[PDB]
Design an enzyme around this catalytic site. Structure first.
Site, PDB file in Angstrom:
ATOM      1  N   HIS A 245       0.844  -1.206   0.000  1.00  0.00           N
ATOM      2  CA  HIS A 245       0.000   0.000   0.000  1.00  0.00           C
ATOM      3  C   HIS A 245       0.878   1.256   0.000  1.00  0.00           C
ATOM      4  O   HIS A 245       1.378   1.656   1.047  1.00  0.00           O
ATOM      5  CB  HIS A 245      -0.917   0.000   1.229  1.00  0.00           C
ATOM      6  CG  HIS A 245      -1.955   1.090   1.250  1.00  0.00           C
ATOM      7  ND1 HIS A 245      -3.253   0.850   1.635  1.00  0.00           N
ATOM      8  CD2 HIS A 245      -1.895   2.416   0.947  1.00  0.00           C
ATOM      9  CE1 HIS A 245      -3.944   1.977   1.560  1.00  0.00           C
ATOM     10  NE2 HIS A 245      -3.143   2.953   1.176  1.00  0.00           N
TER      11      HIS A 245
ATOM     12  N   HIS B 211       1.680   5.393  -1.656  1.00  0.00           N
ATOM     13  CA  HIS B 211       1.407   6.595  -2.437  1.00  0.00           C
ATOM     14  C   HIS B 211       2.708   7.192  -2.929  1.00  0.00           C
ATOM     15  O   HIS B 211       3.553   7.578  -2.146  1.00  0.00           O
ATOM     16  CB  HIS B 211       0.628   7.635  -1.620  1.00  0.00           C
ATOM     17  CG  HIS B 211      -0.697   7.134  -1.162  1.00  0.00           C
ATOM     18  ND1 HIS B 211      -1.841   7.275  -1.905  1.00  0.00           N
ATOM     19  CD2 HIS B 211      -1.057   6.445  -0.047  1.00  0.00           C
ATOM     20  CE1 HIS B 211      -2.849   6.679  -1.273  1.00  0.00           C
ATOM     21  NE2 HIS B 211      -2.399   6.151  -0.151  1.00  0.00           N
TER      22      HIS B 211
ATOM     23  N   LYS C   7      -9.079   0.041  -6.205  1.00  0.00           N
ATOM     24  CA  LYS C   7      -9.158   0.642  -4.882  1.00  0.00           C
ATOM     25  C   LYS C   7     -10.488   1.352  -4.723  1.00  0.00           C
ATOM     26  O   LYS C   7     -10.878   2.184  -5.550  1.00  0.00           O
ATOM     27  CB  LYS C   7      -8.009   1.636  -4.730  1.00  0.00           C
ATOM     28  CG  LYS C   7      -7.973   2.411  -3.395  1.00  0.00           C
ATOM     29  CD  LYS C   7      -7.671   1.499  -2.207  1.00  0.00           C
ATOM     30  CE  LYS C   7      -7.506   2.223  -0.885  1.00  0.00           C
ATOM     31  NZ  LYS C   7      -6.369   3.123  -0.952  1.00  0.00           N
TER      32      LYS C   7
ATOM     33  N   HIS D 209     -10.419   1.154   1.461  1.00  0.00           N
ATOM     34  CA  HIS D 209     -10.235   2.100   2.552  1.00  0.00           C
ATOM     35  C   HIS D 209     -11.598   2.112   3.265  1.00  0.00           C
ATOM     36  O   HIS D 209     -12.542   2.777   2.848  1.00  0.00           O
ATOM     37  CB  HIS D 209      -9.850   3.487   2.043  1.00  0.00           C
ATOM     38  CG  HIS D 209      -9.671   4.487   3.137  1.00  0.00           C
ATOM     39  ND1 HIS D 209      -8.499   5.185   3.310  1.00  0.00           N
ATOM     40  CD2 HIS D 209     -10.514   4.898   4.115  1.00  0.00           C
ATOM     41  CE1 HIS D 209      -8.623   5.948   4.390  1.00  0.00           C
ATOM     42  NE2 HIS D 209      -9.841   5.809   4.879  1.00  0.00           N
TER      43      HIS D 209
ATOM     44  N   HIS E 212      -4.946  -0.825   5.677  1.00  0.00           N
ATOM     45  CA  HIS E 212      -4.554  -0.066   6.856  1.00  0.00           C
ATOM     46  C   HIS E 212      -5.570  -0.142   7.990  1.00  0.00           C
ATOM     47  O   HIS E 212      -6.192   0.858   8.366  1.00  0.00           O
ATOM     48  CB  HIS E 212      -4.178   1.404   6.543  1.00  0.00           C
ATOM     49  CG  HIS E 212      -5.149   2.140   5.677  1.00  0.00           C
ATOM     50  ND1 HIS E 212      -6.512   2.082   5.846  1.00  0.00           N
ATOM     51  CD2 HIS E 212      -4.935   2.993   4.651  1.00  0.00           C
ATOM     52  CE1 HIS E 212      -7.096   2.831   4.926  1.00  0.00           C
ATOM     53  NE2 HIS E 212      -6.157   3.417   4.196  1.00  0.00           N
TER      54      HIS E 212
ATOM     55  N   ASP F 182       1.265   2.590   3.680  1.00  0.00           N
ATOM     56  CA  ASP F 182       0.493   3.788   3.424  1.00  0.00           C
ATOM     57  C   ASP F 182       1.379   5.032   3.493  1.00  0.00           C
ATOM     58  O   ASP F 182       0.922   6.094   3.902  1.00  0.00           O
ATOM     59  CB  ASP F 182      -0.724   3.921   4.326  1.00  0.00           C
ATOM     60  CG  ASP F 182      -1.764   4.881   3.778  1.00  0.00           C
ATOM     61  OD1 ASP F 182      -1.819   5.092   2.539  1.00  0.00           O
ATOM     62  OD2 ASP F 182      -2.599   5.371   4.575  1.00  0.00           O
TER      63      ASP F 182
HETATM   64  O1  LIG Z   1      -6.646   7.687   2.974  1.00  0.00           O
HETATM   65  C1  LIG Z   1      -5.593   8.311   3.091  1.00  0.00           C
HETATM   66  C2  LIG Z   1      -4.993   8.963   1.859  1.00  0.00           C
HETATM   67  C3  LIG Z   1      -3.515   9.253   2.084  1.00  0.00           C
HETATM   68  C4  LIG Z   1      -2.991  10.220   1.068  1.00  0.00           C
HETATM   69  O2  LIG Z   1      -2.561  11.338   1.463  1.00  0.00           O
HETATM   70  O3  LIG Z   1      -2.994   9.843  -0.119  1.00  0.00           O
HETATM   71  N1  LIG Z   1      -3.330   9.778   3.430  1.00  0.00           N
HETATM   72  C5  LIG Z   1      -3.910   9.223   4.474  1.00  0.00           C
HETATM   73  O4  LIG Z   1      -3.628   9.579   5.609  1.00  0.00           O
HETATM   74  N2  LIG Z   1      -4.898   8.358   4.245  1.00  0.00           N
HETATM   75 ZN   LIG Z   2      -6.544   4.823   2.768  1.00  0.00          ZN
HETATM   76 ZN   LIG Z   3      -3.470   5.013   1.210  1.00  0.00          ZN
END
Ligand SMILES: O=C1C[C@@H](C(=O)O)NC(=O)N1
Ligand SMILES: [Zn+2]
Ligand SMILES: [Zn+2]
Ligand SMILES: NC(=O)N[C@@H](CC(=O)O)C(=O)O
Ligand SMILES: [Zn+2]
Ligand SMILES: [Zn+2]
Lengths: 344, 335
Positions: free
Chosen positions: A14, A16, A100, A137, A175, A248
């Site tokens: 997971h 970003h 997702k 999520h 998460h 995450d």
């Molecule tokens: O669901 C999320 C999205 C993620 C983000 O910044 O992409 N940041 C988080 O804290 N949770």
């Molecule tokens: Zn999330």
């Molecule tokens: Zn995420």
């Protein structure tokens, strides 16, 4: 001599990576360590087509330092307007590894999100039919639900009914942050898994709020009370084999974190793996650490386990206070702290 | 537009800080309120008569001409304070009350001689009622204080007058509602207007971060019901607690809402929404004086139901100060 922990090379289920200059800055922190990562689709605008996923995948590959063996596994953002044929084509072509589902909201633009889960049953049925995993999520975001209750409410109102409706659907509860979710996942079948971040194992809401408000610990789903933290720690320490590493890692510039309305997300890619090692060691459960990092995810996704190894060393190191961006700076998880385990 | 004329209010819980910040923030209070309880948590705290006299003069120096404002000073309790020092300040009209913060005082049992002196002389005790043990969840700290500290203290010193400051929970609301004439409470505008969702949903909002922390909606609703009932031992205490912008918007943001500019109109909105404007004057202008044994104010002000636009920022010598509700609208304005 300092203690050494050798594991099969891990993957991050997971992640970003953002886009543009921020992507260029953050990719190396992942690619130096992890063989593969599930790359989330919440760009602006989101990744909702095969063509966009292919182009994004190439931007990620462009940013990987020479010599790093890193493969991004792409995802599709589920939206009301998404054509099930588009999702299936991407899955069949190996472009989309998963799709997702972010929280539903009746006011969502059909191009950007889901209004209600019932409204996207055609795409969900298609995923079930073709064996494509759904990453969730799992929060309900109605204004009258307290933020600390939103995960538990999702289990009751969405997760369980969905899994009863589509009995062959494979789901990763991303998460997880509550005892509610830990127990639900523990008691589920082979089609249900979860990821857990380092922050939700290491900390609880007191760490974010006692002595000051700490926006670098602010993320969604929100840190919960200690009893929930302990349930998560116990779940990973038990050896349960349908929980696996998902950082995450969710980077935002310092000025976007330390503002009047701080963005949610922890930039933990630099420090996550050592943090997980610390937790498994404290729980006297290092015999389950490799499986969490390097085996359980591949098993659930039907992918091979990595055949190379990495080493962590139990030798103290200081985490950077910040990491430069083209403009502004990023503050990593555990910035400025001395940590117990690092990668050799 | 509807106009509401009330007796001039007072603020029974205020932080004015010191130095340049004091100069900036005092006028937001002195233009409206006849008196305020000025909290003693300076660095270093106000723990002597001499320090309180000097601080009072610095406050008066900062009051614009034409504002009839009197600061009511407090002593910061500590484990080792001399009961004679506290009584002297009371007898001289320097100290109106003493303030108990959670650890400074190492423990309450450690200060029993001071508390016994306060009981004997009729000096009110103002309590920040939270327990502090690291393992206690932050949202539980007020409720736990009631059982482990407040109820034992009041059982020991049955004549001591106590204000449970800035209550935030149904637990506290019920405890105060069911208490005797020697127990009162203050409630801030933020704990009536908001709950923790407003601080945490859609982003983290440090300008809503304060102690005691905003609680679940059920607690907010209990506080609203308490003030709307006309219960006469709850009264206005803003806990206006200013910090420079980049002390709030930081990796470790300071607790406190700068609500002095907007508090009175914000309270009016709450009372209106609760169909309880008949109880608004008493909350602002009568209940506190009654509890403290002080006269009510002899002047009157008017509020008008015309939208007030809240400034985005207030200039300081260095940095800015972000008012609570910056850039938003308040429904009621002072005429
Ligand atoms: O669901 C999320 C999205 C993620 C983000 O910044 O992409 N940041 C988080 O804290 N949770
Ligand atoms: Zn999330
Ligand atoms: Zn995420
Ligand atoms: N309420 C706060 O969060 N802060 C107050 C302290 C207090 O009233 O306890 C302050 O003085 O900053
Ligand atoms: Zn206080
Ligand atoms: Zn205060």
């Amino acid at each position: 001599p300092s203690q050494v922990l050798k594991i099969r090379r891990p993957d991050d289920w997971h992640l970003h990576l953002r886009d543009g200059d921020m992507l260029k800055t953050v990719v190396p922190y992942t690619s130096e360590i992890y063989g593969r990562a599930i790359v989330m689709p919440n760009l602006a605008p989101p990744v909702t087509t095969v063509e966009a996923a292919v182009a994004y995948r190439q931007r990620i590959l462009d940013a990987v330092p020479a010599g790093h063996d890193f493969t991004p596994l792409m995802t599709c953002y589920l939206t009301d307007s998404l054509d099930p044929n588009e999702l299936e084509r991407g899955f069949n072509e190996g472009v989309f590894t998963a799709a997702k589902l972010y929280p539903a909201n009746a006011t969502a633009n059909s191009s950007h999100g889901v209004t209600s889960v019932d409204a996207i049953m055609p795409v969900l049925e298609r995923m079930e039919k073709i064996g494509m995993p759904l990453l969730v999520h799992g929060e309900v975001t109605h204004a009258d639900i307290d933020i600390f209750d939103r995960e538990a409410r999702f289990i009751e109102s969405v997760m369980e009914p969905l899994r009863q409706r589509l009995t062959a659907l494979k789901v990763v509860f991303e998460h997880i942050t509550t005892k509610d979710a830990a127990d639900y996942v523990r008691d589920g079948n082979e089609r249900l898994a979860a990821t857990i971040t380092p922050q939700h194992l290491m900390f609880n809401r007191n760490h974010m709020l006692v002595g000051g408000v700490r926006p670098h610990l602010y993320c969604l789903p929100i840190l919960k009370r200690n009893i929930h933290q302990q349930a998560l720690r116990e779940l990973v320490a038990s050896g349960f084999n349908r929980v696996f590493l998902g950082t995450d890692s969710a980077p935002h510039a310092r000025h976007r974190k330390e503002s009047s309305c701080g963005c949610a997300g922890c930039f933990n890619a630099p420090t996550a793996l050592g943090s997980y090692a610390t937790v498994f060691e404290e729980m006297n459960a290092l015999q389950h650490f490799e499986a969490f990092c390097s085996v359980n995810g591949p098993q659930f996704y039907g992918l091979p386990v990595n055949d190379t190894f990495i080493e962590l060393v139990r030798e103290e190191q200081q985490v950077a206070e910040s990491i430069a961006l083209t403009d502004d700076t990023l503050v990593p998880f555990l910035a400025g702290e001395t940590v117990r385990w690092s990668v050799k």
